[PDB]
């Protein structure tokens, strides 16, 4: 009656039920953890929900039990539900598969970008999403918590319905999201201040230099991740398209400038350095890639106007090498870039 595939995924499709309560009506996404399906909750007047069904594998089941505990603590802190985090409705162990029911939201910010053929979000959409990311993460940080896995894939629109607009300048159609309200998802890696901090955190492209250099990490990890995200929303391509540490550090250098000598002198990861400088093969396939494609951050500006200059100033401050020098989210919310927000956007 209950079937799992070779990888421990629960074999389930549209028309299937869980706990004689949740009825699967569609597929919303997939990750390494398993699957996310749309359900009608038959115990809640057929309420539409998103059900995250986790793989029947020990590592994933434990990571989901950790996420559940985090969502419960967040629920205790944000009673009013005004701090822009996914809202856990229920949770259960279903034959070895952990399942987390959430209030149904729209597409994640990466999927909307992918479906808009990587055509970037306009600056006003980027501004409101930044303001909300800064606000949402400032709350969790104030509660002694660090997300660690912020990435476009983990940010969801409350509603992803869009308007198809013909971009005159590109001679093609563009999908413009009608409502830029977002929510932060995936607390499977979220760590409290007093808990054990793994040496390595974050998805590579969104990994800060202090994690690469094994200098320990805290709340500033998330600020770096946001800077990476805002760039990706602005240009539509990842800032650090890398699969390797040495190449990662070279990119950071080309785009942002020299790695502070204080971080070099402190790191135990000396293989990346020779004579106090980053060491790399300029003639390898990575060396050539970086030298051709990785330019100073400023060069990626699409327009010269005041609002574009401020996005780049905020992003640069989000991408400060030294976590101690990195802008805090409390300071970010004060940046002149957010003066361009509409009163509806500012007020929440
Ligand atoms: C792309 C991997 O994950 C997801 O599909 C996903 C995820 C998760 C997780 N974790 C992450 N992006 C969702 C979290 C909450 C809600 Cl309400 C929904 Cl709809 C979610 N979806 C559809
Ligand atoms: Cl520790
Ligand atoms: Cl990787």
UniProtKB/Swiss-Prot annotation:
The keyword Nucleus appears for this protein: yes
Annotated GO MF terms: ATP binding; identical protein binding; protein serine kinase activity; protein serine/threonine kinase activity; protein serine/threonine/tyrosine kinase activity; protein tyrosine kinase activity; RNA binding
Post-translational modification: Autophosphorylates on all three types of residues.
Disulfide cross-links: none
Tissue spec: Endothelial cells.
Domain Protein kinase span(s) in chain numbering: 22-338
Single biological process term from Gene Ontology: protein phosphorylation
EC annotation from Swiss-Prot or TrEMBL: 2.7.12.1
Residues reported in the UniProt entry to bind ATP: 28-36, 52
Phosphoserine found at: 1
GO CC, any one term: nucleus
Regulation: Leucettine L41 inhibits its kinase activity and affects the regulation of alternative splicing mediated by phosphorylation of SR proteins.
UniProt entry tagged with the keyword Nucleotide-binding: yes
Active site per database record: 149 (proton acceptor)
Known catalytic reactions: L-seryl-[protein] + ATP = O-phospho-L-seryl-[protein] + ADP + H(+); L-threonyl-[protein] + ATP = O-phospho-L-threonyl-[protein] + ADP + H(+); L-tyrosyl-[protein] + ATP = O-phospho-L-tyrosyl-[protein] + ADP + H(+)
Domain of life, per lineage: Eukaryota
Record key words, sorted: ATP-binding, Cytoplasm, Cytoplasmic vesicle, Kinase, Nucleotide-binding, Nucleus, Phosphoprotein, Serine/threonine-protein kinase, Transferase, Tyrosine-protein kinase
Family per similarity comment: Belongs to the protein kinase superfamily. CMGC Ser/Thr protein kinase family. Lammer subfamily.
Function: Dual specificity kinase acting on both serine/threonine and tyrosine-containing substrates. Phosphorylates serine- and arginine-rich (SR) proteins of the spliceosomal complex. May be a constituent of a network of regulatory mechanisms that enable SR proteins to control RNA splicing and can cause redistribution of SR proteins from speckles to a diffuse nucleoplasmic distribution. Phosphorylates SRSF1 and SRSF3. Regulates the alternative splicing of tissue factor (F3) pre-mRNA in endothelial cells.
Name listed for the protein in its UniProt record: Dual specificity protein kinase CLK3
Source species: Homo sapiens
Range within the parent protein: 135 to 482 of 490
């Amino acid at each position: 009656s209950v079937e799992d595939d070779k990888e421990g995924h629960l074999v389930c499709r549209i028309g299937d039920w869980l706990q004689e309560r949740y009825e699967i009506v569609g597929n919303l996404g997939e990750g390494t953890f398993g699957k996310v399906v749309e359900c009608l909750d038959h115990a809640r007047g057929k309420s539409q929900v998103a059900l995250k069904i986790i793989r029947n594998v020990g590592k994933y089941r434990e990571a989901a039990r950790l996420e559940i505990n985090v969502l419960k603590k967040i629920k205790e802190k944000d009673k009013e539900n005004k701090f822009l985090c996914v809202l856990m409705s229920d949770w259960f162990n279903f034959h070895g598969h952990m399942c987390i029911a959430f209030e149904l939201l729209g597409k994640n910010t990466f999927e909307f970008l992918k479906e808009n053929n990587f055509q970037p979000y306009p600056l006003p959409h980027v501004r409101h999403m930044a303001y909300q990311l800064c606000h949402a993460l400032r709350f969790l940080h104030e509660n002694q918590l660090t997300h660690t896995d912020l990435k476009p894939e983990n940010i969801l629109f409350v509603n992803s319905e869009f308007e198809t607009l013909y971009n005159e300048h590109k001679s093609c159609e563009e999908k413009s999201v009608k409502n830029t309200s977002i929510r932060v998802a995936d607390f499977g890696s979220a760590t409290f201040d007093h808990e054990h901090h793994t040496t390595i955190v974050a998805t590579r492209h969104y990994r800060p230099p202090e994690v690469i250099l094994e200098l320990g990490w805290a709340q500033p990890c998330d600020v770096w991740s946001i800077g990476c995200i805002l760039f990706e929303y602005y240009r539509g391509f990842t800032l650090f398209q890398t699969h390797e540490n040495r190449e990662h550090l070279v990119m950071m250098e080309k785009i942002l400038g020299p790695i502070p000598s204080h971080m070099i002198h402190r790191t135990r990861k000396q293989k990346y350095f020779y004579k106090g400088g980053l060491v790399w093969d300029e003639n390898s396939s990575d060396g050539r890639y970086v030298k051709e494609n990785c330019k100073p951050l400023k060069s990626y500006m699409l327009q010269d106007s005041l609002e574009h200059v401020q996005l780049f100033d905020l992003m640069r401050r989000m991408l400060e090498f030294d976590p101690a020098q990195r802008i805090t989210l409390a300071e970010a919310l004060l940046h002149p870039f957010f003066a361009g927000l509409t009163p509806e956007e500012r007020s929440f």
